[PDB]
Design a protein around this ligand. Sequence first.
Ligand SMILES: O=c1ccn([C@@H]2O[C@H](COP(=O)(O)OP(=O)(O)O)[C@@H](O)[C@H]2O)c(=O)[nH]1
Ligand SMILES: *[C@@H]1O[C@H](CO)[C@@H](O)[C@H](O)[C@H]1NC(C)=O
Length: 246
Amino acid sequence: DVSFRLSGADPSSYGMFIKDLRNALPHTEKVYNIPLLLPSVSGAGRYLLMHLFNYDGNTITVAVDVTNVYIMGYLALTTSYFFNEPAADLASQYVFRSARRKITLPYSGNYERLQIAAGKPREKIPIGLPALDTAISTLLHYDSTAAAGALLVLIQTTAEAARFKYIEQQIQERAYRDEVPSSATISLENSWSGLSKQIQLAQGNNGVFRTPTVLVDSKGNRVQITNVTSNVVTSNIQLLLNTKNI
Ligand SMILES: O=c1ccn([C@@H]2O[C@H](COP(=O)(O)OP(=O)(O)O)[C@@H](O)[C@H]2O)c(=O)[nH]1
Ligand SMILES: *[C@@H]1O[C@H](CO)[C@@H](O)[C@H](O)[C@H]1NC(C)=O
């Protein structure tokens, strides 16, 4: 398991958490020096538990699928909550079994459905360590509309930061003040599957992408990524979704 405490949190301790999170995801291979997530893992070993504590020391435990860094559900006090999708339903067979009751959330975990449930796109939802503190607090007490927004915050400040150093740094910049994600952040989140695939396809193609990936950079400019020499590949992305899962 990995842990993060918002009480006394700073960019350093958050950085240590994102490092622990990355290091808890198993891999047997690196592709262009980036860890390649496994095609599959059977049984309970598929799920990592993240223990998150809000500023007051209250805690939720979040279950993460280690093959794709997708959040499946979470435990708050004696109640478990899972996304309304088959992967989460499967996860509920292995994690938080000791919960007194299990609630299935009225949405799946993808961004489109969460944004619908939350009533806003995540372009308009501030993120940062204070927002994560809030998200944790919100998830302690069931409110499915509030939870959708909290989960958008949670996903981005955890999984997405694990996947991209740029996003980790974005959150570190928001250690004491929330701010909506940069469009570069949104772009990277939306492109993780695509990038993961093209980096793998580049292996037998002299480092060249079979299909270019379009991203928005830090200045808001739309750029094409065509090969593994790009800074997105050499410096930014930290985890690859296995093509077997794409
Ligand atoms: O369109 C999206 C938006 C978000 N996520 C991921 O959602 C995860 C948690 O959701 P879940 O795995 O339950 O949903 P699924 O993506 O399997 O539909 C996060 O780590 C995000 O990467 C996603 O897979 N697809
Ligand atoms: C590869 O990408 C780099 C970095 O963006 C770019 O400068 C170069 O033109 C590309 N080279 C090839 C062979 O595609």
